[PDB]
Amino acid sequence: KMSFGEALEVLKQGMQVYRSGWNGKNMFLFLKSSDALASDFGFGFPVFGNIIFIKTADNKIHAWVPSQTDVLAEDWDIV
Amino acid sequence: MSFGEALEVLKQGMQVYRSGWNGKNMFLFLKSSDALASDFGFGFGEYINEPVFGNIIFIKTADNKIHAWVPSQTDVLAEDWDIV
Amino acid sequence: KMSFGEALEVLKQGMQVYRSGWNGKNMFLFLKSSDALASDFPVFGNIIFIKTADNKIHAWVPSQTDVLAEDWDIV
Amino acid sequence: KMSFGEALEVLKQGMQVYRSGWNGKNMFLFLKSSDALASDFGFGFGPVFGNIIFIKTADNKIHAWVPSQTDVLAEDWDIV
Ligand SMILES: Nc1ncnc2c1ncn2[C@@H]1O[C@@H]2COP(=O)(O)OP(=O)(O)OC[C@H]3O[C@@H](O[C@H]2[C@H]1O)[C@H](O)[C@@H]3O
Ligand SMILES: Nc1ncnc2c1ncn2[C@@H]1O[C@@H]2COP(=O)(O)OP(=O)(O)OC[C@H]3O[C@@H](O[C@H]2[C@H]1O)[C@H](O)[C@@H]3O
Ligand SMILES: [Mg+2]
């Protein structure tokens, strides 16, 4: 059981994290830097910020919204 | 404009903003799953399965960067939306 | 069923809403004024709470899927 | 303190925090405990209230706070 602060630092360093308290299964977060996104996103418009994604239960890729439940929780772990 | 009306404008591909925001010249824009897949990827090597995105809403922020838009309670409840 | 815009007005009118597409069951949203804080210790906005799958009350944070979805229903 | 994880610990101890990089000036966050919330709202004594983070905005409005991803990743947090 990691705090959100611990999970956050690990996410910053390129690891994947998740909460056991989430309802959906097999989900996780991953962080992409501005440089990574400048290459990955080919759809035209220039400069991305850092974006955290959540791989969801249906295996789709979404933007992760930091819920208060998530940020206050201490049930985080590393994939 | 309510947020419900701003959402309908977003789903039509146009850009929306709140006057009550602090940062200037910001706006939201929506990219669909099909749009995000178009020319997506590092382009070197092959995925087992092509990534499938959900819809993503971006915000063009006051420093002219592109971020993921987190819908705030203030945003969602506000009545000060407009089209760019 | 309902759009998020419709769910928001139902919330403002004192009813409870949820998405049928959520993973967790037995959850819902409800809205109150934050002016209940005035007695503690400014313009008070409304607050959207979530009653969670593990029976807690938190301040709700919409995902992008939540606000784009058309599967909202009334409790 | 600097990171968001540190700011959350400051919030939990009852102090106020802000980001110097925010566009709005003189804003801050504060956290109310389950006990304080149940007393204020009249329910959730234990369905039980959790903690809730609020924001006082630059226009003097009070809302439940929603973190942006930039907020959570930022290192410019400070104590009021
Ligand atoms: N298809 C998704 N698209 C975007 N984002 C998603 C998806 N799927 C999951 N998320 C995010 O993971 C968190 C935990 O997942 P979860 O426990 O399974 O959520 P849920 O039961 O479906 O309820 C929903 C509430 O959860 C909170 O955080 C959720 C979501 O932010 C939110 O406030 C939700 O309103
Ligand atoms: N570089 C950004 N990166 C990501 N997201 C951003 C950025 N810049 C702006 N946003 C988003 O637009 C909203 C309105 O913009 P804003 O009025 O100028 O925000 P603010 O004064 O800087 O921060 C105070 C609070 O605003 C709320 O919504 C903000 C942000 O979600 C949040 O809860 C903030 O914690
Ligand atoms: Mg590219």
Q: Resolution in Å, one decimal, please.
A: 1.8
Q: Which residue type does D62 have?
A: I
Indicate whether residue C21 lines ligand 1 (CB < 6 A): no
User: Chain centroid to CA A7: how far?
Assistant: 10
Is there a contact between C48 and B11 if contact means CB atoms under 8 Å apart?
no
DSSP string covering chain C: -B-HHHHHHHHHTT--EEETT-SSSS-EEEEEEGGGGTT---EEPEEEEEE-TTSEEEE----HHHHH-S-EEE-
Number of domains in chain A: 1
Largest Cα span, chain D: 39
- Write the secondary structure of C59-72 as one string of H (helix), E (strand) and C (coil): ECCCCHHHHHCCCE
Instruction: Give the separation between CA A59 and CA C48, rounded to whole angstroms.
Output: 28
- Mutation pick from C28, C34, C39, C64 vs chain D, by most beta carbons of D within 10 Å, is C34
**Structural domain of B37:** 3-83
Report how far apart, in Å, the C-alpha atoms of A39 and of each of A16, A32, A53, B53, B69 are.
20, 11, 16, 16, 20
Q: Which residue type does A47 have?
A: V
Burial of C44 (0-12, 13-18, 19+ CB in 10 A): middle
Angle at the Cα of A22 (from C60 to D46), degrees rounded to 5?
A: 60
The protein residue with its alpha carbon nearest to ligand 2, atom 14, reads B21
- Write the secondary structure of D31-67 as one string of H (helix), E (strand) and C (coil): EECHHHHHHHHCCCECCEECCEEEEECCCCEEEECCC
Own/partner long-range contacts of D33-40 (Cβ < 8 Å, ≥24 apart): D36/C40, D37/C57, D40/C36, D40/C37, D40/C39, D40/C40
Q: Are strands C56-59 and D48-49 parallel, antiparallel or unpaired?
A: parallel
Q: How many CB atoms lie within 10 A of CB B19?
A: 8
Cβ–Cβ < 8 Å for C45, B77: yes
Closest by alpha carbon to D53, among B76, A72, C3, B70?
Answer: A72
Q: Which tokens belong to C9? A: 């007005």
The protein residue with its alpha carbon nearest to ligand 1, atom 27, reads A67
Q: How far apart are the first and last CA of chain A?
A: 12
The protein residue with its alpha carbon nearest to ligand 1, atom 29, reads C63
Instruction: Give the separation between CA A53 and CA A32, rounded to whole angstroms.
Output: 8
Cβ–Cβ < 8 Å for A30, A18: no
Instruction: Give the separation between CA A55 and CA A44, rounded to whole angstroms.
Output: 24
A64 labeled binding residue: yes
Q: What is the DSSP letter of A2?
A: B
b/e map A10-37, b = 16+ CB within 10 Å = bbbeeeebbbeebeeeebbbbbbeeeee
Instruction: Give the separation between CA D40 and CA B13, rounded to whole angstroms.
Output: 43
Closest by alpha carbon to C64, among B35, B56, B37?
Answer: B56
Instruction: Give the separation between CA A56 and CA B47, rounded to whole angstroms.
Output: 18
Cβ–Cβ < 8 Å for A49, B65: yes
3-class DSSP state of D11: helix
Instruction: Give the separation between CA B37 and CA A57, rounded to whole angstroms.
Output: 19
Q: Which residue type does C5 have?
A: G
Cβ–Cβ < 8 Å for C50, C28: yes
Cβ–Cβ < 8 Å for D34, D49: yes
CB proximity list for B80: less than 8 A, separation 6 or greater? B1, B18, B19, B20
Instruction: Give the separation between CA C4 and CA B81, rounded to whole angstroms.
Output: 16
**B55: chain C residues, CB-CB within 8 Å:** 64-65, 68
Largest Cα span, chain A: 41
CB proximity list for A35: less than 8 A, separation 6 or greater? none
Closest by alpha carbon to B77, among D79, C39, C34?
Answer: C34
Cβ–Cβ < 8 Å for B31, B60: no
User: Chain centroid to CA D18: how far?
Assistant: 9
CB proximity list for B46: less than 8 A, separation 6 or greater? none
Instruction: Give the separation between CA D37 and CA C68, rounded to whole angstroms.
Output: 30
Burial of C52 (0-12, 13-18, 19+ CB in 10 A): buried
Indicate whether residue D71 lines ligand 2 (CB < 6 A): yes
Closest by alpha carbon to D63, among D35, D24, D9?
Answer: D24
DSSP string covering B14-61: --EEETT-SSSS-EEEEE-HHHHHTT-S-SSS--SS---B--EEEEE-
Instruction: Give the separation between CA A54 and CA A30, rounded to whole angstroms.
Output: 7
3-class DSSP state of A17: strand
